[PDB]
Amino acid sequence: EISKGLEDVNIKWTRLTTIDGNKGILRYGGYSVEDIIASGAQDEEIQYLFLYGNLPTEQELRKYKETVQKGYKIPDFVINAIRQLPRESDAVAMQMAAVAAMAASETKFKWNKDTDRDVAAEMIGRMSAITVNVYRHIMNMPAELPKPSDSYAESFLNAAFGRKATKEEIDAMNTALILYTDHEVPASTTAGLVAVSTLSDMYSGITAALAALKGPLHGGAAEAAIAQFDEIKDPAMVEKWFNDNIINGKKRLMGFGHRVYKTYDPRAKIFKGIAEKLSSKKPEVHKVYEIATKLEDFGIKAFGSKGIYPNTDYFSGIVYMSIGFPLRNNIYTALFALSRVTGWQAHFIEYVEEQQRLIRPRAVYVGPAERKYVPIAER
Amino acid sequence: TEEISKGLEDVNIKWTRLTTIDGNKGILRYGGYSVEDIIASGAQDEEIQYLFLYGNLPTEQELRKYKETVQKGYKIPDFVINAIRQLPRESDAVAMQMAAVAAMAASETKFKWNKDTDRDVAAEMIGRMSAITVNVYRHIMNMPAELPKPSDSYAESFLNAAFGRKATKEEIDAMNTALILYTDHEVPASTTAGLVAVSTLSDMYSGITAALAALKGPLHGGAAEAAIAQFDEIKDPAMVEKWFNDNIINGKKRLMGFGHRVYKTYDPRAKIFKGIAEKLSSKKPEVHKVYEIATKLEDFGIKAFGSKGIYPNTDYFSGIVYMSIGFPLRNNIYTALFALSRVTGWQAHFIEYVEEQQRLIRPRAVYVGPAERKYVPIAER
Numbered sequence: 001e002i003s004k005g006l007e008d009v010n011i012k013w014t015r016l017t018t019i020d021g022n023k024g025i026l027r028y029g030g031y032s033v034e035d036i037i038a039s040g041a042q043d044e045e046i047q048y049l050f051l052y053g054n055l056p057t058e059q060e061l062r063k064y065k066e067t068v069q070k071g072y073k074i075p076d077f078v079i080n081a082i083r084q085l086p087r088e089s090d091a092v093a094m095q096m097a098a099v100a101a102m103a104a105s106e107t108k109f110k111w112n113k114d115t116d117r118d119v120a121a122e123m124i125g126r127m128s129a130i131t132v133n134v135y136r137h138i139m140n141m142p143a144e145l146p147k148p149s150d151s152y153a154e155s156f157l158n159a160a161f162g163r164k165a166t167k168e169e170i171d172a173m174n175t176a177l178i179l180y181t182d183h184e185v186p187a188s189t190t191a192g193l194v195a196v197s198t199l200s201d202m203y204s205g206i207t208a209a210l211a212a213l214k215g216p217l218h219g220g221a222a223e224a225a226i227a228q229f230d231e232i233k234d235p236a237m238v239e240k241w242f243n244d245n246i247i248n249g250k251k252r253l254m255g256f257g258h259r260v261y262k263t264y265d266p267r268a269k270i271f272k273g274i275a276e277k278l279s280s281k282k283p284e285v286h287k288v289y290e291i292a293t294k295l296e297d298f299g300i301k302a303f304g305s306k307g308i309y310p311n312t313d314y315f316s317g318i319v320y321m322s323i324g325f326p327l328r329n330n331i332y333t334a335l336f337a338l339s340r341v342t343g344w345q346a347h348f349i350e351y352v353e354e355q356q357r358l359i360r361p362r363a364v365y366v367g368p369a370e371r372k373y374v375p376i377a378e379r
Numbered sequence: 380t381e382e383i384s385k386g387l388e389d390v391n392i393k394w395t396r397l398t399t400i401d402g403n404k405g406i407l408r409y410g411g412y413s414v415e416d417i418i419a420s421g422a423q424d425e426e427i428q429y430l431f432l433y434g435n436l437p438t439e440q441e442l443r444k445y446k447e448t449v450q451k452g453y454k455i456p457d458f459v460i461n462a463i464r465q466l467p468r469e470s471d472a473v474a475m476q477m478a479a480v481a482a483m484a485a486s487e488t489k490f491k492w493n494k495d496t497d498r499d500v501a502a503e504m505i506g507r508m509s510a511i512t513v514n515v516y517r518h519i520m521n522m523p524a525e526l527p528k529p530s531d532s533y534a535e536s537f538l539n540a541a542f543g544r545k546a547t548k549e550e551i552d553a554m555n556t557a558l559i560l561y562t563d564h565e566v567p568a569s570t571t572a573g574l575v576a577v578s579t580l581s582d583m584y585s586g587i588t589a590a591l592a593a594l595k596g597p598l599h600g601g602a603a604e605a606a607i608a609q610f611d612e613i614k615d616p617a618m619v620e621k622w623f624n625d626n627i628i629n630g631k632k633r634l635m636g637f638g639h640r641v642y643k644t645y646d647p648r649a650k651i652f653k654g655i656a657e658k659l660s661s662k663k664p665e666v667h668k669v670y671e672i673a674t675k676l677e678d679f680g681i682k683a684f685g686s687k688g689i690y691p692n693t694d695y696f697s698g699i700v701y702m703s704i705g706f707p708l709r710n711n712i713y714t715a716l717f718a719l720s721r722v723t724g725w726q727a728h729f730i731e732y733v734e735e736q737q738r739l740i741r742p743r744a745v746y747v748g749p750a751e752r753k754y755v756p757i758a759e760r
């Protein structure tokens with residue numbers, strides 16, 4: 001019978017990403033994400049790694065960035081797929097609308113060894129363009145496109161905010177990009193894999209992945225976690241809130257728990273370090289951080305023994321808030337998606353190119369036995 | 380944790396009360412009712428929608444009310460219509476539906492999973508799917524926007540609005556049957572993608588968007604166009620065996636509209652579609668020609684592939700029925716008409732999963748990539 005939540009079912013092999021959930025170890029193509037972050041690698045180097053299977057030389061990187069910046073120009077109708085929507089709309093749903101627009105108009109897309117990586121590189125560029133325009137629309141600003149610059153992170157932040165981002169902001173965004181690049185087969189990547197396993201196009205695969213990312217149990221926690229801290233308002237109030245909501249109210253502690261990690265999420269640890277550093281400079285944000293660390297202590301004491309620990313989404317919102325993004329319209333989840341689009345595409349290409357099979361499971365029937373079609377009077 | 384469940388074959392992802400399939404004997408029941416018995420009995424598509432949302436056939440009272448809720452979906456906001464019409468006219472019809480539903484996912488800020496309201500939301504969305512699909516068809520054909528209106532039937536409301544003229548009783552009855560036949564099929568790739576999305580507690584409209592994403596592909600709902608496109612390519616019945624040997628038997632391509640993950644015999648829906656395709660196409664000689672190519676190719680296919688349990692599926696004949704009704708072969712329109720029907724099953728499954736057996740869907744992969752290695756700075760590579 002039933003493989004609930006597909007727990008421990010292997011749906012593919014991958015060369016892209018390994019996770020040890022018991023030791024809390026995450027590697028991208030053999031490199032620890034700690035090593036990548038310490039090194040100061042640019043996010044484009046890690047995008048290249050995902051698409052090509054190795055780190056690029058300076059020459060390969062120059063070539064790659066040129067392909068990504070092709071995506072910074074997007075059709076007027078893709079922008080308009082966003083802006084023609086109401087402003088109170090969820091930021092991720094807005095990204096879905098825009099990607100659905102390309103799914104629709106890219107009539108020539110074909111799965112092909114020779115073109116897949118270039119389509120994917122250009123799409124990483126368009127995700128930046130779409131995410132800029134999602135943020136501008138929500139904030140009721142003019143439409144704008146990212147421009148080529150020293151970095152993908154800088155290009156994104158400069159177009160989103162319409163000012164020059166500082167070095168510290170750019171470096172934090174660059175790390176955010178790397179930390180959310182991929183995580184093997186979470187619900188979002190799985191939904192996308194199901195879509196591309198019918199040989200539906202890359203963009204539809206992204207659209208499905210976004211539909212799943214949106215939910216509070218997955219990437220939607222990037223907004224729901226920080227919303228808990230915002231409710232608490234005052235650190236003195238933490239214990240009471242925690243007993244009221246979590247111990248006595250049976251609600252889940254958002255930003256804790258993971259299907260795979262039964263220990264502290266190694267990405268959460270890095271995000272926590274950045275949150276502490278970036279927030280301390282901003283009094284309103286610093287106090288959100290303080291609430292979060294007090295709450296975390298209670299959570300770990302209550303849940304640690306069940307293998308339920310902070311995940312990435314517990315701290316990533318504070319990182320985004322400190323960079324300058326507001327807590328509204330699930331913006332934080334849209335920022336997760338911007339990063340994750342690289343891992344989604346790399347997985348879909350690996351799946352379709354090398355181990356293609358329709359994904360089509362079964363259900364256990366527990367409904368009514370065969371019965372004769374009843375006429376209306378006798379019902 | 381070393382073996383790979385390839386395509387999740389025979390993995391059970393949920394329990395269901397809704398639909399049962401016997402793959403070896405070729406039996407499909409909805410809520411205990413055989414699809415053959417449903418069609419023979421003259422069920423209205425609205426009765427089967429109700430069946431899916433509520434678990435039994437409706438009394439005359441329940442049905443009148445249900446139909447009113449559905450018709451509320453016929454009024455859709457102008458930005459949902461515009462999500463379709465601002466796209467290039469050359470776009471895939473299913474991807475236009477996806478654009479329109481994503482627009483709803485964006486704007487339905489108040490949606491919440493709730494046993495009290497799920498079924499009314501789902502009923503209204505079935506009306507909205509009719510309005511969306513009308514407008515996709517209209518945009519493709521460069522016609523003005525239009526909304527369906529209440530009539531004696533959901534199928535009639537749809538056809539009248541799509542074509543801008545009164546549908547005949549024959550057309551209506553064919554569409555009504557196509558709506559029932561495509562309602563649900565347990566957990567195909569589309570339903571599965573949607574279930575994954577809703578397992579995160581994402582909203583119903585996002586679940587439908589993910590399902591549309593998957594249905595579009597040619598190994599799934601895209602076959603409804605790809606199979607009939609084979610018949611269109613062959614063009615001359617004398618040429619069928621030649622085509623089949625050049626394209627299929629040499630291993631160049633799969634025979635579209637044959638084969639199934641579950642059925643290892645003739646699809647019971649395909650038997651029904653075949654009977655209708657024959658009756659309706661015989662009234663239009665240019666379409667009858669298509670049907671005659673199809674049945675000639677079908678005979679070669681079953682002789683070649685029958686022993687492997689590869690038989691006609693639903694998509695082999697469905698394009699012919701839609702063509703006979705008046706829908707052209709272009710822009711994946713036949714797949715959009717599949718989606719029109721299947722939205723009922725999708726929602727009914729999502730509701731059953733979230734309400735009664737909710738759990739995040741989150742599998743694993745087997746790692747076969749590079750062993751642990753030290754990061755090398757870019758200057759030294």
Ligand SMILES: CC(C)(COP(=O)(O)OP(=O)(O)OC[C@H]1O[C@@H](n2cnc3c(N)ncnc32)[C@H](O)[C@@H]1OP(=O)(O)O)[C@@H](O)[C@H](O)NCCC(=O)NCCCC(=O)C[C@@](O)(CC(=O)O)C(=O)O
Binds near residue numbers: 218221313
């Ligand atoms: C859904 C899940 C993430 C994982 O849970 P599972 O589906 O593996 O386990 P489950 O739902 O069956 O729960 C098992 C038990 O553990 C409890 N539980 C699990 N998480 C809890 C929590 N956070 N608080 C309280 N109880 C929690 C749960 O109630 C239940 O208790 P009982 O029914 O046995 O009483 C939960 O921890 C939980 O809902 N977390 C809160 C929401 C949240 O923070 N989500 C963010 C997760 C991180 C992300 O989405 C990003 C991600 O890492 C995801 C990925 O890789 O999968 C990525 O990079 O793509």
Ligand SMILES: CC(C)(COP(=O)(O)OP(=O)(O)OC[C@H]1O[C@@H](n2cnc3c(N)ncnc32)[C@H](O)[C@@H]1OP(=O)(O)O)[C@@H](O)[C@H](O)NCCC(=O)NCCCC(=O)C[C@@](O)(CC(=O)O)C(=O)O
Binds near residue numbers: 386600602637639
């Ligand atoms: C994908 C599948 C539907 C099912 O195949 P599986 O994924 O179960 O198996 P597979 O791809 O692993 O194939 C098994 C073998 O059978 C061969 N094969 C299978 N179908 C074939 C075909 N149609 N033509 C030629 N060869 C075919 C295949 O090459 C392979 O050969 P070997 O490598 O063993 O030598 C295939 O039959 C095939 O692609 N069909 C053609 C496209 C097509 O008509 N698809 C429409 C299916 C109908 C629908 O999508 C609607 C659906 O019923 C779907 C549902 O319920 O699942 C619904 O209601 O939602």
